[PDB]
């Protein structure tokens, strides 16, 4: 009954080629977060990287100016029933 | 065979209790799942009471002793779930709550075993 | 919940029976740290570690099987309560050096078997 | 199959009113040894005291000179099968 998806994903600071994102930790043991991003126009390879379970912010670099990006975060988390498993993503869009 | 049924019957009751308690309560406080802790503390209290009580009743059927200890306390408590909870906290970089879980489970179980033992010991005296 | 209940009772009985058989054969061989109680805690730590990495890569496994391997087998196989009285008995026997050794070998050793179980399947996959 | 009964019970030193006894610990976890002693002849009250499980010697005092004494030792030990229980006794006779 306890959601393992992060909440309140948002860009808190932005340059034309980078984004500072942050989110609220879910109420479970998160081993690490996985951040996905890519150009919204489904004509670009999506990239993924991890940040430790203790962090709740991440910098996305190497972006293009004035381009629409889709950014998602999900968790690799421990729970009693499922041991390690991946949560559904939370997703936002942001134009640099 | 009669001993096998004591372990299976006692273990099934202990495992069933641990499964129900852990699911209902572990998610309430994931830094130290209280369902896994409570089954370990309760199994210690029982095994401590059983330690003192069985000492003074030497004519008790070994069927009852084996069902309450190797059976119930064995199915009820767990070291494996305790393990993955600490392992998961260690991989999550939450070192302080990994150590705390180790201390609370070990120190806390030995105390409940003492309580079960001395309460029965003080009562018979 | 009834199908889930059968998963707990079946795997738990196999774990409890395994723990009861291994303990009665090997514990008296070395009373300062009974190796049967250790081996079932190490083994359950190993299995739960492999289960940790394997279940992560097989997210569509029937919860019936995941419940029978962890809460059932590992839960019934491992034990915290018998580990408690062994340390309690050593403390009451004034054998502190082996009470502390028993506490360390079980805790440090179960986590390592959990790590070994996790990292082996992770390196394989 | 491991005996919890002590072996090689013997008096190592004596005075007219006292006895220093020693034994070999059994291959179990003894919590304490029980030492009982009484006058071998007829109906004299057997007395008993406990010795911690780490010790394997004990002093018996307040005896009468030139009297036959029966001394027995047994353990309160822990085992997996029986939790806390008592072993059978090992017994010797000694005349002060
Ligand atoms: C008492 C001993 C018991 C037996 C040994 C148990 C060992 C348990 C932890 C091992 O697992 C590793 O732990 C690292 C530390 O949590 C993780 O680092 C991850 O998180 C760190 C957080 O600071 C980052 O710095 C790392 O780059 C990142 O890989 C890493 O992924 C993980 O595989
Ligand atoms: C850090 C977590 C702690 C959790 C709780 C631990 C509980 C420990 C219980 C210890 O039990 C006592 O141990 C004493 C020491 O072994 C015994 O003394 C007996 O044995 C001693 C050692 O030989 C002698 O010095 C004493 O005189 C003799 O009474 C005593 O009978 C016994 O009840
Ligand atoms: C976190 C808490 C840590 C501390 C826990 C408590 C430790 C101190 C206990 C004090 O009371 C003890 O009670 C024992 C009985 O329960 C007595 O054992 C006496 O009687 C026992 C048998 O009942 C024998 O085994 C013992 O050797 C003999 O000393 C012992 O003398 C006495 O001092
Ligand atoms: Br047990
Ligand atoms: Br478990
Ligand atoms: F374990
Ligand atoms: F316990
Ligand atoms: Na168990």
Coordinates of C-alpha atoms and ligand atoms in Angstrom, one line a residue:
Chain A
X1 CA 0.0 0.0 0.0
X2 CA 3.1 2.2 0.3
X3 CA 4.0 3.8 -3.0
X4 CA 7.6 3.4 -4.2
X5 CA 7.4 6.0 -6.9
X6 CA 9.1 9.4 -6.2
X7 CA 6.9 12.4 -6.1
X8 CA 7.2 16.1 -7.0
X9 CA 9.8 15.7 -9.8
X10 CA 10.8 19.1 -11.1
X11 CA 13.6 21.1 -12.6
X12 CA 14.8 23.4 -9.8
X13 CA 17.6 25.1 -11.8
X14 CA 18.3 25.2 -15.6
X15 CA 21.0 26.4 -17.9
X16 CA 20.6 26.1 -21.7
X17 CA 22.6 22.8 -21.7
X18 CA 22.0 21.4 -18.2
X19 CA 19.2 20.7 -15.7
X20 CA 19.2 20.4 -11.9
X21 CA 16.2 18.2 -11.0
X22 CA 14.9 17.1 -7.6
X23 CA 12.2 14.8 -6.2
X24 CA 10.6 13.6 -3.0
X25 CA 11.8 10.2 -1.8
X26 CA 9.1 7.5 -1.6
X27 CA 8.4 6.0 1.8
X28 CA 10.4 2.9 1.1
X29 CA 14.1 1.8 1.3
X30 CA 15.5 3.1 -2.0
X31 CA 18.8 1.4 -3.0
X32 CA 19.3 3.8 -5.9
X33 CA 17.3 6.1 -8.2
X34 CA 17.5 5.8 -12.0
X35 CA 17.2 9.0 -14.0
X36 CA 16.1 8.7 -17.7
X37 CA 16.1 11.6 -20.2
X38 CA 15.8 12.3 -23.9
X39 CA 14.3 14.6 -26.5
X40 CA 10.5 14.4 -26.3
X41 CA 10.3 14.1 -30.1
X42 CA 10.8 10.3 -30.2
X43 CA 13.9 10.7 -32.5
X44 CA 16.7 10.6 -29.9
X45 CA 18.3 7.8 -27.8
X46 CA 17.1 7.8 -24.2
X47 CA 20.0 7.8 -21.7
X48 CA 19.9 6.5 -18.1
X49 CA 22.2 7.0 -15.0
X50 CA 21.9 6.2 -11.3
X51 CA 22.2 8.3 -8.2
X52 CA 22.5 6.7 -4.7
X53 CA 19.5 6.1 -2.6
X54 CA 20.5 8.9 -0.2
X55 CA 20.5 11.6 -2.9
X56 CA 17.3 13.3 -4.1
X57 CA 18.7 15.6 -6.7
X58 CA 20.6 15.0 -10.0
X59 CA 22.3 17.1 -12.7
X60 CA 21.5 16.3 -16.3
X61 CA 24.2 17.6 -18.6
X62 CA 25.1 17.6 -22.3
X63 CA 21.7 18.9 -23.4
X64 CA 20.8 21.0 -26.5
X65 CA 19.4 24.5 -26.3
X66 CA 15.7 25.2 -26.9
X67 CA 14.9 21.5 -27.2
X68 CA 12.1 19.7 -25.4
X69 CA 13.2 16.9 -23.0
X70 CA 11.3 14.1 -21.2
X71 CA 12.8 13.3 -17.8
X72 CA 11.8 10.4 -15.7
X73 CA 12.9 9.0 -12.3
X74 CA 12.2 5.6 -10.9
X75 CA 13.6 3.6 -8.0
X76 CA 15.4 0.3 -7.4
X77 CA 14.0 -0.3 -3.9
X78 CA 13.8 -3.0 -1.3
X79 CA 10.4 -4.1 0.1
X80 CA 9.3 -7.1 2.1
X81 CA 7.2 -8.8 -0.5
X82 CA 9.3 -8.0 -3.6
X83 CA 12.9 -7.8 -2.3
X84 CA 14.6 -5.7 -5.0
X85 CA 12.4 -4.4 -7.8
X86 CA 11.9 -1.3 -9.9
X87 CA 9.1 1.2 -9.4
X88 CA 7.0 2.8 -12.0
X89 CA 8.5 6.1 -13.2
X90 CA 7.5 9.7 -12.5
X91 CA 7.9 11.9 -15.6
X92 CA 8.1 15.5 -16.5
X93 CA 8.8 17.5 -19.6
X94 CA 11.1 20.5 -19.8
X95 CA 12.3 22.7 -22.6
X96 CA 15.8 24.1 -22.3
Chain B
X1 CA 8.4 -39.0 12.8
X2 CA 6.4 -37.7 15.8
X3 CA 9.3 -35.2 16.2
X4 CA 9.0 -34.2 12.5
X5 CA 5.3 -33.4 13.1
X6 CA 6.3 -31.2 16.1
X7 CA 8.7 -29.2 14.0
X8 CA 6.3 -28.9 11.0
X9 CA 3.3 -28.0 13.1
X10 CA 5.2 -25.6 15.3
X11 CA 7.2 -24.2 12.3
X12 CA 4.1 -23.7 10.2
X13 CA 2.4 -21.7 13.0
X14 CA 5.6 -19.6 13.5
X15 CA 6.1 -19.0 9.8
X16 CA 2.5 -18.1 9.4
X17 CA 2.7 -15.6 12.2
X18 CA 5.9 -14.1 10.8
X19 CA 4.4 -13.8 7.3
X20 CA 1.3 -12.0 8.6
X21 CA 3.1 -9.6 11.0
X22 CA 5.8 -8.7 8.6
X23 CA 3.5 -7.7 5.7
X24 CA 1.2 -5.7 7.8
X25 CA 4.0 -3.7 9.6
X26 CA 7.3 -3.7 7.8
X27 CA 6.2 -0.9 5.5
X28 CA 5.3 1.3 8.4
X29 CA 9.0 2.0 9.2
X30 CA 11.3 0.7 6.5
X31 CA 14.5 1.9 8.2
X32 CA 14.0 -1.0 10.7
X33 CA 11.0 -3.1 9.7
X34 CA 9.1 -3.5 12.9
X35 CA 7.3 -6.7 11.8
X36 CA 10.6 -8.5 11.4
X37 CA 11.9 -7.1 14.7
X38 CA 8.7 -8.1 16.7
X39 CA 8.8 -11.7 15.6
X40 CA 12.5 -11.8 16.6
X41 CA 11.8 -10.2 20.0
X42 CA 8.7 -12.4 20.6
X43 CA 10.6 -15.5 19.7
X44 CA 13.3 -14.5 22.2
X45 CA 10.9 -13.8 25.0
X46 CA 9.2 -17.2 24.4
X47 CA 12.5 -19.1 24.1
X48 CA 13.7 -17.4 27.4
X49 CA 10.5 -18.4 29.2
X50 CA 10.8 -21.8 27.7
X51 CA 14.4 -22.0 28.9
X52 CA 13.5 -21.3 32.5
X53 CA 10.2 -23.2 32.5
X54 CA 11.5 -26.4 30.9
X55 CA 14.4 -26.6 33.3
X56 CA 12.0 -27.1 36.2
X57 CA 9.7 -29.6 34.6
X58 CA 12.0 -32.4 33.6
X59 CA 9.1 -34.8 33.0
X60 CA 7.6 -32.7 30.2
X61 CA 6.9 -34.5 27.0
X62 CA 9.7 -33.7 24.5
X63 CA 7.0 -33.3 21.9
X64 CA 5.8 -30.0 23.6
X65 CA 9.4 -28.7 24.1
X66 CA 10.3 -29.3 20.4
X67 CA 7.1 -27.7 19.1
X68 CA 7.5 -24.5 21.1
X69 CA 11.2 -24.0 20.5
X70 CA 12.5 -25.7 17.3
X71 CA 9.0 -25.3 15.9
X72 CA 7.3 -22.1 16.9
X73 CA 10.4 -20.0 17.8
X74 CA 12.2 -21.3 14.7
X75 CA 9.5 -20.5 12.3
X76 CA 8.6 -17.3 14.0
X77 CA 12.0 -15.7 14.2
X78 CA 14.2 -15.1 11.1
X79 CA 17.8 -14.3 10.5
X80 CA 17.4 -14.2 6.7
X81 CA 15.0 -11.3 6.5
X82 CA 17.1 -9.5 9.1
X83 CA 20.0 -10.1 6.7
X84 CA 18.5 -8.6 3.5
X85 CA 17.1 -5.6 5.4
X86 CA 20.6 -4.8 6.7
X87 CA 22.2 -5.6 3.3
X88 CA 19.6 -3.4 1.5
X89 CA 20.4 -0.5 3.9
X90 CA 24.1 -1.0 3.4
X91 CA 23.7 -0.8 -0.4
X92 CA 21.5 2.2 0.1
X93 CA 24.3 4.0 1.9
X94 CA 22.2 4.2 5.0
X95 CA 25.0 2.9 7.2
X96 CA 23.7 4.4 10.5
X97 CA 20.4 2.5 10.2
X98 CA 22.2 -0.7 9.1
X99 CA 24.3 -0.7 12.3
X100 CA 21.2 0.3 14.4
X101 CA 19.2 -2.6 13.0
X102 CA 22.1 -5.0 13.9
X103 CA 22.4 -3.7 17.5
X104 CA 18.6 -3.5 18.1
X105 CA 18.0 -7.1 16.8
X106 CA 20.9 -8.7 18.6
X107 CA 20.9 -6.7 21.9
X108 CA 17.1 -6.6 21.9
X109 CA 16.6 -10.3 21.4
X110 CA 19.1 -11.2 24.1
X111 CA 17.2 -8.9 26.5
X112 CA 13.8 -10.5 25.7
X113 CA 15.4 -13.9 26.2
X114 CA 16.6 -12.7 29.6
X115 CA 13.2 -11.3 30.5
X116 CA 11.5 -14.6 29.6
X117 CA 14.1 -16.4 31.7
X118 CA 14.2 -14.2 34.8
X119 CA 10.5 -13.6 35.0
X120 CA 10.0 -17.3 35.3
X121 CA 13.0 -17.7 37.6
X122 CA 11.8 -14.9 39.9
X123 CA 8.3 -16.3 39.8
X124 CA 9.4 -19.8 41.0
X125 CA 11.4 -18.1 43.8
Chain C
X1 CA -4.5 -15.3 0.8
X2 CA -5.1 -19.0 1.0
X3 CA -2.8 -19.8 -1.9
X4 CA -0.2 -17.5 -0.3
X5 CA -0.7 -19.4 3.0
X6 CA 0.2 -22.7 1.3
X7 CA 3.4 -21.1 0.0
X8 CA 4.5 -20.1 3.5
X9 CA 3.6 -23.4 5.2
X10 CA 5.2 -25.6 2.5
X11 CA 8.5 -23.7 2.2
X12 CA 8.5 -23.0 6.0
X13 CA 8.2 -26.7 6.8
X14 CA 11.0 -27.6 4.5
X15 CA 13.2 -24.9 6.0
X16 CA 12.2 -25.8 9.6
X17 CA 12.7 -29.5 8.9
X18 CA 16.1 -28.8 7.3
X19 CA 17.1 -26.6 10.2
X20 CA 15.9 -29.2 12.7
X21 CA 17.8 -32.1 11.0
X22 CA 21.0 -30.1 10.5
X23 CA 21.0 -28.8 14.1
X24 CA 20.5 -32.2 15.8
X25 CA 23.4 -33.7 13.8
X26 CA 26.1 -30.9 14.0
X27 CA 25.4 -28.6 17.0
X28 CA 26.9 -30.8 19.7
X29 CA 30.1 -31.2 17.6
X30 CA 31.2 -27.7 18.8
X31 CA 29.2 -26.3 21.6
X32 CA 31.0 -22.8 21.8
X33 CA 29.4 -22.0 18.4
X34 CA 27.0 -24.7 17.3
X35 CA 27.7 -25.2 13.6
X36 CA 24.2 -26.4 12.7
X37 CA 22.5 -23.2 13.8
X38 CA 25.3 -21.3 12.0
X39 CA 25.1 -23.3 8.7
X40 CA 21.3 -22.8 8.4
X41 CA 21.7 -19.1 9.0
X42 CA 24.6 -18.9 6.5
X43 CA 22.7 -21.0 4.0
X44 CA 19.5 -19.0 4.4
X45 CA 21.6 -15.9 4.0
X46 CA 23.1 -17.3 0.8
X47 CA 19.7 -18.2 -0.6
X48 CA 18.1 -14.9 0.2
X49 CA 21.0 -13.1 -1.4
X50 CA 20.6 -15.1 -4.7
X51 CA 16.9 -14.5 -4.4
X52 CA 17.5 -10.8 -4.1
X53 CA 19.4 -10.5 -7.4
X54 CA 17.4 -13.2 -9.2
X55 CA 14.0 -11.8 -8.4
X56 CA 15.1 -8.4 -9.5
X57 CA 15.8 -9.8 -13.0
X58 CA 12.6 -11.9 -13.1
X59 CA 9.8 -9.4 -12.2
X60 CA 7.0 -11.6 -13.5
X61 CA 7.6 -14.6 -11.2
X62 CA 4.4 -15.8 -9.5
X63 CA 4.4 -14.3 -6.0
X64 CA 3.6 -17.8 -4.8
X65 CA 7.1 -18.9 -5.6
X66 CA 8.8 -15.7 -4.2
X67 CA 6.8 -16.2 -1.0
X68 CA 7.8 -19.9 -0.7
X69 CA 11.6 -19.3 -1.2
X70 CA 12.0 -16.3 1.1
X71 CA 9.3 -16.1 3.8
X72 CA 9.0 -19.9 3.6
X73 CA 12.3 -21.6 3.0
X74 CA 14.8 -18.9 4.2
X75 CA 12.4 -17.8 7.0
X76 CA 11.9 -21.4 8.2
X77 CA 15.5 -22.4 7.6
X78 CA 17.2 -19.4 9.4
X79 CA 16.6 -18.8 13.1
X80 CA 17.2 -15.9 15.5
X81 CA 15.7 -17.4 18.6
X82 CA 18.0 -20.5 18.9
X83 CA 20.9 -18.1 18.1
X84 CA 19.6 -16.1 21.1
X85 CA 19.6 -18.8 23.8
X86 CA 23.0 -20.1 22.6
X87 CA 24.5 -16.7 23.3
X88 CA 22.4 -16.4 26.5
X89 CA 23.6 -19.8 27.7
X90 CA 27.2 -18.8 27.0
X91 CA 26.7 -15.5 28.9
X92 CA 25.2 -17.3 31.9
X93 CA 28.1 -19.8 31.7
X94 CA 30.5 -16.9 32.0
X95 CA 31.8 -17.7 28.5
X96 CA 31.7 -14.1 27.2
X97 CA 34.5 -14.5 24.6
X98 CA 32.4 -17.1 22.7
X99 CA 29.2 -15.2 23.3
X100 CA 30.7 -12.2 21.4
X101 CA 32.2 -14.5 18.8
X102 CA 28.8 -16.2 18.2
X103 CA 27.2 -12.7 17.8
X104 CA 29.9 -11.6 15.3
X105 CA 30.1 -14.8 13.2
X106 CA 26.4 -15.0 12.7
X107 CA 25.8 -11.3 11.9
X108 CA 28.9 -10.7 9.8
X109 CA 28.6 -14.2 8.2
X110 CA 25.0 -14.0 7.2
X111 CA 25.5 -10.6 5.5
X112 CA 28.5 -12.0 3.6
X113 CA 26.5 -15.0 2.4
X114 CA 23.8 -12.5 1.4
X115 CA 26.4 -10.4 -0.5
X116 CA 27.9 -13.5 -2.0
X117 CA 24.5 -14.8 -3.1
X118 CA 23.6 -11.4 -4.5
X119 CA 26.9 -10.6 -6.3
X120 CA 27.4 -14.1 -7.8
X121 CA 24.1 -14.0 -9.6
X122 CA 24.8 -10.4 -10.5
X123 CA 28.1 -11.3 -12.0
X124 CA 26.6 -14.3 -13.8
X125 CA 23.8 -12.1 -15.2
Chain D
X1 CA 25.4 -38.6 21.9
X2 CA 27.7 -36.3 23.7
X3 CA 27.9 -36.9 27.5
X4 CA 27.1 -34.0 29.8
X5 CA 28.3 -36.0 32.8
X6 CA 31.7 -34.8 34.2
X7 CA 34.5 -37.3 34.3
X8 CA 37.6 -38.0 36.4
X9 CA 36.2 -36.7 39.7
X10 CA 38.9 -36.9 42.3
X11 CA 40.1 -35.2 45.5
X12 CA 43.3 -33.4 44.9
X13 CA 43.9 -31.9 48.4
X14 CA 42.4 -32.5 51.8
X15 CA 42.4 -31.4 55.4
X16 CA 40.6 -33.1 58.3
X17 CA 37.5 -30.9 57.7
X18 CA 37.8 -29.9 54.1
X19 CA 38.2 -31.4 50.6
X20 CA 39.3 -29.8 47.3
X21 CA 37.8 -31.7 44.4
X22 CA 38.4 -31.4 40.7
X23 CA 36.8 -32.8 37.6
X24 CA 37.0 -32.8 33.8
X25 CA 34.3 -30.6 32.1
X26 CA 32.0 -32.4 29.7
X27 CA 32.0 -31.5 26.1
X28 CA 28.9 -29.3 26.3
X29 CA 28.0 -25.8 27.6
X30 CA 27.8 -26.2 31.4
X31 CA 26.0 -23.3 33.1
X32 CA 26.8 -24.6 36.5
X33 CA 27.9 -27.7 38.3
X34 CA 26.0 -29.1 41.3
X35 CA 28.2 -30.5 44.1
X36 CA 26.6 -32.8 46.7
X37 CA 28.3 -34.5 49.6
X38 CA 27.2 -36.5 52.6
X39 CA 28.4 -39.1 55.1
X40 CA 28.5 -42.4 53.3
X41 CA 27.1 -44.3 56.4
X42 CA 23.4 -44.4 56.7
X43 CA 21.1 -41.4 57.1
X44 CA 23.1 -38.2 57.1
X45 CA 21.7 -35.2 55.4
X46 CA 23.3 -34.8 52.0
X47 CA 24.1 -31.1 51.3
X48 CA 24.6 -29.4 48.0
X49 CA 25.8 -26.2 46.4
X50 CA 26.5 -24.8 42.9
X51 CA 29.7 -23.9 41.2
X52 CA 29.8 -21.7 38.0
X53 CA 30.2 -23.6 34.8
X54 CA 33.7 -22.1 34.1
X55 CA 35.2 -23.6 37.2
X56 CA 36.2 -27.2 37.3
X57 CA 37.2 -27.3 41.0
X58 CA 35.4 -26.7 44.3
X59 CA 36.1 -26.7 48.0
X60 CA 34.0 -28.7 50.5
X61 CA 34.3 -27.4 54.1
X62 CA 32.9 -28.0 57.5
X63 CA 33.4 -31.8 57.5
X64 CA 34.1 -34.0 60.4
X65 CA 37.6 -35.5 60.7
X66 CA 37.9 -39.2 60.0
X67 CA 34.5 -39.7 58.3
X68 CA 33.6 -41.4 55.0
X69 CA 32.0 -39.0 52.6
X70 CA 30.1 -39.7 49.3
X71 CA 30.7 -36.8 46.9
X72 CA 28.7 -36.5 43.6
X73 CA 28.9 -33.9 40.8
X74 CA 26.4 -33.2 38.0
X75 CA 25.8 -30.4 35.6
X76 CA 23.1 -27.9 34.6
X77 CA 24.0 -27.6 31.0
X78 CA 22.5 -26.3 27.7
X79 CA 22.0 -28.5 24.7
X80 CA 20.0 -28.0 21.5
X81 CA 17.6 -30.9 22.2
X82 CA 16.9 -30.2 25.9
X83 CA 17.5 -26.5 26.4
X84 CA 18.5 -26.2 30.1
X85 CA 18.6 -29.7 31.7
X86 CA 20.6 -31.7 34.3
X87 CA 23.1 -34.4 33.6
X88 CA 23.6 -37.7 35.4
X89 CA 26.0 -37.6 38.4
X90 CA 29.5 -38.8 38.8
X91 CA 30.2 -40.0 42.4
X92 CA 33.2 -40.8 44.6
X93 CA 33.8 -41.8 48.2
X94 CA 36.4 -40.2 50.4
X95 CA 37.4 -40.5 54.0
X96 CA 38.7 -37.3 55.7
Ligands
LIG1 C1 29.5 -5.7 7.9 C2 29.8 -6.3 6.6 C3 28.8 -7.1 6.0 C4 29.2 -7.8 4.7 C5 29.4 -6.9 3.5 C6 28.1 -6.2 3.0 C7 28.4 -5.2 1.9 C8 27.1 -4.4 1.5 C9 27.4 -3.2 0.6 C10 28.0 -3.7 -0.7 O1 27.2 -3.1 -1.8 C11 27.7 -1.9 -2.3 O2 27.5 -0.9 -1.4 C12 28.0 0.4 -1.8 C13 27.9 1.4 -0.7 O3 26.5 1.6 -0.3 C14 27.2 0.9 -3.0 O4 27.7 2.1 -3.6 C15 26.8 2.9 -4.3 O5 26.3 4.0 -3.4 C16 27.4 4.8 -2.9 C17 26.8 5.8 -1.9 O6 27.7 6.7 -1.4 C18 28.1 5.5 -4.0 O7 29.2 6.2 -3.5 C19 28.6 4.4 -5.0 O8 29.3 5.0 -6.1 C20 27.5 3.5 -5.4 O9 28.0 2.5 -6.3 C21 27.3 -0.2 -4.1 O10 26.5 0.1 -5.3 C22 26.9 -1.6 -3.6 O11 27.0 -2.6 -4.6
LIG2 C1 24.7 -6.6 25.7 C2 23.3 -7.3 25.6 C3 22.9 -7.9 26.9 C4 21.6 -8.6 26.8 C5 21.2 -9.3 28.1 C6 22.2 -10.3 28.6 C7 21.8 -11.1 29.8 C8 22.9 -11.9 30.5 C9 22.4 -12.9 31.6 C10 23.6 -13.3 32.4 O1 23.1 -14.3 33.4 C11 24.0 -14.3 34.6 O2 25.3 -14.5 34.2 C12 26.2 -14.5 35.3 C13 27.6 -14.5 34.7 O3 27.9 -15.6 33.9 C14 25.9 -15.7 36.2 O4 26.8 -15.6 37.4 C15 27.4 -16.9 37.7 O5 28.5 -17.1 37.0 C16 29.5 -16.1 37.1 C17 30.7 -16.4 36.2 O6 31.3 -17.7 36.5 C18 30.0 -16.1 38.6 O7 31.0 -15.0 38.8 C19 28.8 -15.8 39.5 O8 29.1 -15.8 40.9 C20 27.7 -16.8 39.2 O9 26.5 -16.6 40.0 C21 24.5 -15.6 36.6 O10 24.1 -16.7 37.4 C22 23.6 -15.5 35.4 O11 22.2 -15.4 35.9
LIG3 C1 21.2 -6.4 30.8 C2 21.2 -7.1 32.1 C3 22.5 -7.8 32.5 C4 22.5 -8.4 33.9 C5 21.5 -9.6 34.0 C6 21.5 -10.2 35.4 C7 22.8 -10.7 35.9 C8 22.9 -10.7 37.5 C9 21.9 -11.6 38.2 C10 21.9 -11.4 39.7 O1 21.1 -12.4 40.2 C11 21.6 -13.8 40.0 O2 20.6 -14.7 39.9 C12 21.0 -16.0 39.6 C13 19.8 -16.9 39.4 O3 19.0 -16.4 38.4 C14 21.9 -16.5 40.7 O4 22.5 -17.7 40.3 C15 22.8 -18.8 41.3 O5 21.9 -19.8 41.0 C16 21.9 -20.3 39.7 C17 20.8 -21.4 39.6 O6 19.5 -20.8 39.8 C18 23.3 -20.9 39.4 O7 23.3 -21.3 38.0 C19 24.3 -19.8 39.6 O8 25.6 -20.3 39.4 C20 24.2 -19.3 41.0 O9 25.1 -18.2 41.2 C21 23.1 -15.5 41.0 O10 23.9 -15.9 42.1 C22 22.5 -14.1 41.2 O11 23.6 -13.2 41.3
LIG4 BR1 14.8 -22.3 17.0
LIG5 BR1 13.0 -14.0 4.9
LIG6 F1 20.5 -15.4 7.4
LIG7 F1 15.0 -14.5 18.6
LIG8 NA1 13.4 -18.8 11.3

